[PDB]
Amino acid sequence: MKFPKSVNMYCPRCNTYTQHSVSNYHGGQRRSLAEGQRRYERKLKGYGSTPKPKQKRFAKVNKKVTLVFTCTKCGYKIVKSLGRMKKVELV
Amino acid sequence: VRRFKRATKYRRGSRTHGWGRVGQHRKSGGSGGKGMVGFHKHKWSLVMKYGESGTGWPFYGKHGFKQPETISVEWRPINVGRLAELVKELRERGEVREEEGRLVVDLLKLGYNKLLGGGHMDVPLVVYTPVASKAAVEKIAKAGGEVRIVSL
Amino acid sequence: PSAYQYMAMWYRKVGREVHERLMRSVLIKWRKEPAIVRVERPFRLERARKLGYKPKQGVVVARVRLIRGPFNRRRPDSGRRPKRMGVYGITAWKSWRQVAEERAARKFPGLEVLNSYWVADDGIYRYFEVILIDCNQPTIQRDPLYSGICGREVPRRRLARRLRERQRKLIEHLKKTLLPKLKG
Amino acid sequence: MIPKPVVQVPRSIKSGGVTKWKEGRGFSLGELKEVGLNAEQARLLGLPVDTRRDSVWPQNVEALRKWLIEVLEGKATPPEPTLPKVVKVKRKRGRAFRGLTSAGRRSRGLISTRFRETHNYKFKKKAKERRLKKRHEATKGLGNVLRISRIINES
RNA sequence: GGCUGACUGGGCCCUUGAACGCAAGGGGCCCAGGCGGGAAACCGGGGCCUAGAGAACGCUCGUGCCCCCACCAGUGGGGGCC
RNA sequence: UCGUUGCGGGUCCGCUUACCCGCCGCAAGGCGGGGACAGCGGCAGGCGGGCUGUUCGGCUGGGGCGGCACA
RNA sequence: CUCGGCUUAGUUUUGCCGGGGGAACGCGCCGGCCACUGGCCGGCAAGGCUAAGCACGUCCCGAGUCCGAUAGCGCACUAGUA
RNA sequence: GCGGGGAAAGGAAACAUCUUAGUACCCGCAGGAAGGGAAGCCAACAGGGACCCCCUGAGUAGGGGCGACCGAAAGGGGGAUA
Numbered sequence: 001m002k003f004p005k006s007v008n009m010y011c012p013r014c015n016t017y018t019q020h021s022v023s024n025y026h027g028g029q030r031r032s033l034a035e036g037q038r039r040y041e042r043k044l045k046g047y048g049s050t051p052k053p054k055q056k057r058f059a060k061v062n063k064k065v066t067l068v069f070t071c072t073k074c075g076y077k078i079v080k081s082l083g084r085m086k087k088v089e090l091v
Numbered sequence: 092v093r094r095f096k097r098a099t100k101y102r103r104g105s106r107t108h109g110w111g112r113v114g115q116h117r118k119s120g121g122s123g124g125k126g127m128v129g130f131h132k133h134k135w136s137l138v139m140k141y142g143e144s145g146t147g148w149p150f151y152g153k154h155g156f157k158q159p160e161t162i163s164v165e166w167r168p169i170n171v172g173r174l175a176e177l178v179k180e181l182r183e184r185g186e187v188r189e190e191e192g193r194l195v196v197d198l199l200k201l202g203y204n205k206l207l208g209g210g211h212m213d214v215p216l217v218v219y220t221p222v223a224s225k226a227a228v229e230k231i232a233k234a235g236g237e238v239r240i241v242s243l
Numbered sequence: 244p245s246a247y248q249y250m251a252m253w254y255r256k257v258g259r260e261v262h263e264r265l266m267r268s269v270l271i272k273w274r275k276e277p278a279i280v281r282v283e284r285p286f287r288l289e290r291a292r293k294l295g296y297k298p299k300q301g302v303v304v305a306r307v308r309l310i311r312g313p314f315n316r317r318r319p320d321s322g323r324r325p326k327r328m329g330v331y332g333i334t335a336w337k338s339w340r341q342v343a344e345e346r347a348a349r350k351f352p353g354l355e356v357l358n359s360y361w362v363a364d365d366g367i368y369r370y371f372e373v374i375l376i377d378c379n380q381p382t383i384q385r386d387p388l389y390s391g392i393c394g395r396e397v398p399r400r401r402l403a404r405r406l407r408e409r410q411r412k413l414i415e416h417l418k419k420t421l422l423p424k425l426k427g
Numbered sequence: 428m429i430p431k432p433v434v435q436v437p438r439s440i441k442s443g444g445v446t447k448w449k450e451g452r453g454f455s456l457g458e459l460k461e462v463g464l465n466a467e468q469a470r471l472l473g474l475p476v477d478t479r480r481d482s483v484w485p486q487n488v489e490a491l492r493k494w495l496i497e498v499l500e501g502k503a504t505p506p507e508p509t510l511p512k513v514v515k516v517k518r519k520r521g522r523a524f525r526g527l528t529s530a531g532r533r534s535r536g537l538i539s540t541r542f543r544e545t546h547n548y549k550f551k552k553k554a555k556e557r558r559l560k561k562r563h564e565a566t567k568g569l570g571n572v573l574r575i576s577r578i579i580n581e582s
Numbered sequence: 583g584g585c586u587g588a589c590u591g592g593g594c595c596c597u598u599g600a601a602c603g604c605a606a607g608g609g610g611c612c613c614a615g616g617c618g619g620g621a622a623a624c625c626g627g628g629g630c631c632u633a634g635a636g637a638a639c640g641c642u643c644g645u646g647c648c649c650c651c652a653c654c655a656g657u658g659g660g661g662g663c664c
Numbered sequence: 665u666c667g668u669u670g671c672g673g674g675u676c677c678g679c680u681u682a683c684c685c686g687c688c689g690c691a692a693g694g695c696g697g698g699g700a701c702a703g704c705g706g707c708a709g710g711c712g713g714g715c716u717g718u719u720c721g722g723c724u725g726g727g728g729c730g731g732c733a734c735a
Numbered sequence: 736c737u738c739g740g741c742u743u744a745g746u747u748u749u750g751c752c753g754g755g756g757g758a759a760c761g762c763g764c765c766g767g768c769c770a771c772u773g774g775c776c777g778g779c780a781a782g783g784c785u786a787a788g789c790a791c792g793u794c795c796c797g798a799g800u801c802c803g804a805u806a807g808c809g810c811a812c813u814a815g816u817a
Numbered sequence: 818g819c820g821g822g823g824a825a826a827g828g829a830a831a832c833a834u835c836u837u838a839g840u841a842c843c844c845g846c847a848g849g850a851a852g853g854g855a856a857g858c859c860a861a862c863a864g865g866g867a868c869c870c871c872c873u874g875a876g877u878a879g880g881g882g883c884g885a886c887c888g889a890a891a892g893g894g895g896g897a898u899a
């Protein structure tokens with residue numbers, strides 16, 4: 001499905017409607033200093049089987065479409081989901 | 092004290108001892124596992140009854156952090172109404188020094204370290220406390236007393 | 244600064260390169276001697292004296308050579324859960340220094356190990372020197388440090404009598420020189 | 428009646444300002460100095476002496492002055508001196524084999540941390556509790572039984 | 583033809599789950615903020631209605647003049663609530 | 665790959681004394697070959713049913729195959 | 736300090752072992768729950784000993800809402816015997 | 818009693834991290850007790866003052882397929898005191 005690159009949206013910070021630029025959400029890089037990553041690396045040390053579960057069978061065909069709407073006036077970002085469907089084409 | 096006959100006395104001659112003939116008295120399979128187990132599969136209905144829906148929170152999961160207790164004050168507050176009772180008893184035994192024409196009490200020697208505002212103050216009182224709430228200071232001051240904040 | 248302070252310089256940064264030249268020759272001989280050898284004098288004299296060595300009759304200094312690295316962990320030959328199957332990297336809770344002291348003690352039965360210290364390393368071996376004392380020797384028995392290992396007995400009648408006398412004499416002295424000041 | 432030193436209980440942050448007194452290990456050198464004694468003389472009089480303590484409490488000084496006067500006037504009998512009365516050192520056998528040399532003490536953790544926090548101490552402490560079923564080892568899984576029961580009974 | 587309500591913060595109810603305990607999901611009625619269409623009434627919190635739906639732990643992003651990190655202050659870093 | 669690993673000369677050459685291999689000797693030590701390689705220890709990647717622990721779901725006109733009447 | 740490993744409540748933070756690297760010196764060094772800086776506070780590792788107060792039961796003494804010869808220790812007896 | 822080596826069954830309603838458990842057992846070494854013991858301590862600007870053992874702190878902090886489950890220390894009261 002096609003989606004605009006710019007929309008007029010309510011900005012909670014500006015308390016008004018402003019133009020918003022649209023972009024795809026991209027997950028950030030897992031940082032090694034994250035507490036769960038520190039615990040995992042500890043658990044990975046030493047002997048033993050593989051310590052944690054690792055999913056093998058997957059069932060979803062598509063992911064939820066997540067878009068970042070950036071306010072052009074103040075930079076406030078709203079990340080919203082459009083539901084589970086194939087990747088949108090930002091037009 | 093009242094004493095009651097043990098159930099084993101009644102159960103002699105009953106074959107099953109209260110466990111029924113069909114689902115008899117078996118091992119840990121009759122409890123659905125050993126210990127506090129099963130709460131996410133077959134005892135999940137017990138979590139849904141007592142816990143938060145959706146997350147089963149108190150049974151499972153994390154919430155918040157704990158402020159370290161070794162660097163946190165353990166408060167022992169006293170209400171204004173309860174304090175008024177206390178000074179009445181203290182005065183009768185003579186433990187109160189009316190230092191300045193008013194009864195003087197200091198909470199720390201009484202074992203408290205905060206003053207709260209529930210109840211009524213019926214006498215003028217000088218209170219030496221590290222911490223006092225807003226209503227405690229007002230109620231004490233409306234009775235002709237005063238709160239004095241000491242430094243820990 | 245004692246000469247012992249200067250002797251320690253060969254195990255410090257200033258003297259390491261000269262010492263490391265010397266050991267490259269010395270270790271050739273030590274690799275061909277018996278694994279445990281009694282030596283006339285300690286190799287690190289300043290270190291040995293700090294650890295209780297003195298050249299008395301009945302003090303034995305033994306040099307011990309042993310193979311370094313981790314201990315000989317065995318691969319289990321029956322059923323184990325995977326955590327208990329590893330070999331590489333698993334070491335003993337004993338240091339090689341304690342192992343050296345124990346091996347020395349086997350060669351000198353009846354002697355007590357006082358202390359030990361590291362002397363040298365090579366690619367395969369580690370060298371220690373172990374101080375042992377003979378607790379049956381009259382010279383050893385009366386030594387103030389070695390008596391802690393060899394045993395010491397002082398009758399209670401000796402210390403208590405001496406203490407009671409000292410207390411009695413002190414009270415008489417304090418009557419003159421202190422009682423007026425206390426009451427004044 | 429030989430006095431006992433009175434010292435202040437350390438005031439923790441958790442206490443919030445509430446303080447109390449306790450019996451100390453011994454009289455401080457400052458307190459002994461005010462009554463004209465050193466550590467040796469005070470110990471010869473049977474007094475407990477604590478040369479580590481820095482505080483000087485007037486109530487301790489006052490108790491010392493009162494009792495010293497009784498002793499120096501023949502009204503009170505000092506107890507036996509607070510110094511060693513026996514010397515009992517046993518011959519040691521197999522120090523190296525029982526981990527009592529410096530190398531053994533290091534591996535046992537006794538150089539870096541306290542005896543109570545060493546791993547062999549933890550192993551022995553918990554083994555005793557389980558053998559006698561003392562305190563928390565009378566019930567295995569006690570914490571989880573309490574946790575689940577609190578949720579059900581406090582819902 | 584003009585638009586973005588496929589909106590921000592919340593509450594209540596119906597169904598999933600009959601009378602009768604019990605997830606997630608879905609639907610309905612509203613209050614506040616700020617909009618769109620319309621003369622106005624009114625309607626819009628996706629698709630005329632009944633399907634297209636995912637716990638804990640972990641990670642990631644958004645948000646806040648936001649809270650915490652062990653004697654005190656600072657810098658980097660970490661953690662927390664939504 | 666880190667250490668063992670040293671010495672001369674302009675990454676290369678050489679050397680032997682480390683170390684390794686064999687012969688002689690009771691031992692001391694000698695002879696020959698190799699040689700800072702190899703071997704050995706730690707760390708890392710690959711191959712690895714040689715060996716260790718386990719999982720191999722449910723419904724079902726018995727089970728199995730199928731199907732999903734499993735959401 | 737770093738890497739591997741066992742362990743520990745010790746968690747970016749327990750102890751240790753092994754491989755590699757590796758100080759300073761009292762005008763110094765160490766600790767104060769991630770690292771560093773400043774302040775303040777507390778101390779002086781890497782040497783040795785130490786009574787009392789605490790574990791146990793072959794053995795000795797005492798006791799008993801304990802058992803009473805298929806019980807009570809396997810053994811009340813030419814039982815650790817045949 | 819001290820040092821070292823060191824499981825599995827079972828539990829987690831499967832099972833591998835984990836637990837069981839530094840247990841069973843093995844190897845070495847002591848005493849009538851052993852081990853510990855005299856601050857490179859703990860605390861928080863107020864002060865404690867070697868150690869071991871008992872009561873408590875406390876199933877608290879904390880560790881943990883944050884699951885099962887595991888689990889302190891300081892402080893306080895005592896025995897005893899060098």
Ligand SMILES: [Mg+2]
Nearest residue numbers: 110111114115
């Ligand atoms: Mg039943």
Ligand SMILES: [Mg+2]
Nearest residue numbers: 112113114115
């Ligand atoms: Mg049935």
Ligand SMILES: [Mg+2]
Nearest residue numbers: 112113115116
């Ligand atoms: Mg039956």
Ligand SMILES: [Mg+2]
Nearest residue numbers: 130131132135
């Ligand atoms: Mg579940």
Ligand SMILES: [Mg+2]
Nearest residue numbers: 153154155662
């Ligand atoms: Mg979290």
Ligand SMILES: [Mg+2]
Nearest residue numbers: 323324825826
């Ligand atoms: Mg198993």
Ligand SMILES: [Mg+2]
Nearest residue numbers: 563564567568
């Ligand atoms: Mg427990």
Ligand SMILES: [Mg+2]
Nearest residue numbers: 598599604605
């Ligand atoms: Mg349902």
Ligand SMILES: [Mg+2]
Nearest residue numbers: 599600601602
């Ligand atoms: Mg119903």
Ligand SMILES: [Mg+2]
Nearest residue numbers: 598607608635
């Ligand atoms: Mg649905």
Ligand SMILES: [Mg+2]
Nearest residue numbers: 161652767860
């Ligand atoms: Mg602190």
Ligand SMILES: [Mg+2]
Nearest residue numbers: 700701702703
């Ligand atoms: Mg090579």
Ligand SMILES: [Mg+2]
Nearest residue numbers: 703704705706
């Ligand atoms: Mg290799």
Ligand SMILES: [Mg+2]
Nearest residue numbers: 713715716717
């Ligand atoms: Mg197989």
Ligand SMILES: [Mg+2]
Nearest residue numbers: 719720721831
């Ligand atoms: Mg399966």
Ligand SMILES: [Mg+2]
Nearest residue numbers: 722723724727
């Ligand atoms: Mg079937």
